[PDB]
Structures are given as structure tokens and as C-alpha cells.
Design an enzyme around this catalytic site. Structure first.
Site, PDB file in Angstrom:
ATOM      1  N   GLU A 185      -9.403  10.517  -5.815  1.00 21.32           N
ATOM      2  CA  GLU A 185      -8.054  11.106  -5.878  1.00 21.32           C
ATOM      3  C   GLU A 185      -7.935  12.066  -7.035  1.00 21.32           C
ATOM      4  O   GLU A 185      -8.603  11.894  -8.016  1.00 21.32           O
ATOM      5  CB  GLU A 185      -6.969  10.018  -6.055  1.00 21.32           C
TER       6      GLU A 185
ATOM      7  N   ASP B 143      -9.682   6.798  -2.368  1.00 20.17           N
ATOM      8  CA  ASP B 143      -9.174   7.059  -3.719  1.00 20.17           C
ATOM      9  C   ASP B 143     -10.210   6.737  -4.812  1.00 20.17           C
ATOM     10  O   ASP B 143     -10.248   7.402  -5.823  1.00 20.17           O
ATOM     11  CB  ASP B 143      -7.860   6.285  -3.938  1.00 20.17           C
TER      12      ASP B 143
ATOM     13  N   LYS C 234      -1.100   0.841   6.716  1.00 17.37           N
ATOM     14  CA  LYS C 234      -2.299   1.514   6.185  1.00 17.37           C
ATOM     15  C   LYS C 234      -3.578   1.021   6.862  1.00 17.37           C
ATOM     16  O   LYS C 234      -4.504   1.828   7.064  1.00 17.37           O
ATOM     17  CB  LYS C 234      -2.428   1.324   4.687  1.00 17.37           C
TER      18      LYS C 234
END
Ligand SMILES: O=C(O)C(=O)CC(=O)c1ccccc1
Ligand SMILES: [Mn+2]
Ligand SMILES: [Mn+2]
Length: 191
Positions: free
Chosen positions: A76, A104, A130
Site C-alpha cells: 500500500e 497491502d 472483503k
């Protein structure tokens, strides 16, 4: 106008986080002054991704000698090209399956990519949404001090996780004091 949230965000987060969030927003046609909740959500997600990575080396905790390997790679906060450049590197190094969606973090101890989620809504329901849109281990944190992680595998020690959960409980309270919580919460997609 959004002035109030924007100013809160600038004093809540450190200048690196803030610059990165502004950078991400300008890149995709988004003004931090106008979409101020987004501004706050982008910063918060960066800080959690950095907190999660802080202090961890291989597998020990250090608050940094020269032969230690960082436990986590951070994906990220990089533009897409760089983000994918880094995932390709990890896949060559380790032989791990390349994921279809950008994650991430990569954990070199467990050899898995991590999706870090952050939500103002309830932690379980967000996890489930998710997990449906995705191999990649998922770990969700809420602003009320909760987390949920794939197969009850929380990756980090409890103290580390307490540090992020407390950080996020504290952002809620500070916003709540300023009568900004209710509107920041309500702006998140979904119930
Ligand atoms: O929502 C999150 O927790 C993300 O971590 C999002 C992210 O990185 C991303 C990647 C590609 C397109 C849109 C969002
Ligand atoms: Mn991401
Ligand atoms: Mn994420």
C-alpha cells in the site's frame, strides 16, 4: 463545507501519511479539501498498514541492527506500477502465487500476502464482504476497537494489535468530541 474534517485530518496524522493520502487523491482526480471523509479514510488505512509493519523483523520485535530482515513488505502507498513491481519481486523470491488483486502487505515469516481492512461499520460484516471480493490473508480493524482475521489467525502478537486497535478507538473518540464521528461513519458505503 468540509473544512472541519479536513483540519482534523491534518492534525491527527503525521506529515508523511498526509502527503501520501493527498498524493493518492490527486492521482485519481480527487481533491482532499472536497472529499474530506475519503481523505480521513485514506490516511487511517495508511497508518494501520504502517503500524502493522513497525518493529517486526526476522522472527523478533525491535524498537535496528543491519543483518535483520523486515518482517513485512509494504505494498500500500505505492502507485499501481510500483505496487505490482513489488509483488512480482516477492513472487520471484518466494514462489508464492501471485494474487489477482493488489494486497497491502507481504509477511515473509508466514509467506502470505495480507489484505488489511479498516471500517467504521461492524467488523464481521465487513470481513465477510472483503472475503467475498477475494490465499490472501485478510485482517480487518474497526474504529470501535475490534478486529477479525482469517481462520482466527491474527499474525501479530496481542500488544501490537492492541496498539492499532487503541489508535483507532482514539481517532473515533477525538472525532466524536468534535461532533464529526456520526458523519464520518455514515459516509462509508453500506449499513
Ligand atoms: O480498501 C482497502 O483496504 C484497500 O486496501 C484498497 C486498495 O488497495 C485498492 C486497490 C486497487 C483499487 C482500489 C483499492
Ligand atoms: Mn490496498
Ligand atoms: Mn486494504
Amino acid at each position: 463545507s468540509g473544512m472541519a474534517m479536513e483540519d482534523f485530518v491534518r492534525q491527527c496524522f503525521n506529515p508523511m501519511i498526509v502527503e501520501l493520502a493527498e498524493k493518492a487523491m490527486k492521482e485519481y482526480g480527487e481533491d482532499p479539501k472536497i472529499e474530506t471523509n475519503k481523505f480521513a479514510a485514506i490516511c487511517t488505512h495508511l497508518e494501520v498498514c504502517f503500524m502493522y509493519s513497525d518493529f517486526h523483523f526476522i522472527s523478533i520485535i525491535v524498537e535496528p541492527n543491519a543483518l535483520l530482515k523486515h518482517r513485512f513488505e509494504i505494498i500500500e502507498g505505492r502507485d499501481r506500477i510500483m505496487a505490482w513491481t513489488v509483488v512480482n519481486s516477492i513472487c520471484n523470491t518466494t514462489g508464492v502465487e501471485k494474487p489477482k488483486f493488489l494486497p497491502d502487505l507481504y509477511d515473509y515469516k508466514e509467506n502470505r500476502f495480507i489484505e488489511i481492512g479498516v471500517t467504521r461499520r461492524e467488523v464481521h460484516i465487513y470481513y465477510l464482504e472483503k472475503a467475498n471480493k477475494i490465499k490472501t490473508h485478510i485482517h480487518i480493524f474497526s474504529f470501535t476497537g475490534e478486529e477479525m482475521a482469517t481462520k482466527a489467525d491474527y499474525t501479530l502478537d496481542e500488544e501490537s494489535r492492541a496498539r492499532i486497535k487503541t489508535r483507532l478507538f482514539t481517532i473515533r473518540q477525538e472525532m466524536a468530541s468534535r461532533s464529526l464521528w456520526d458523519s464520518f461513519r455514515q459516509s462509508e458505503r453500506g449499513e
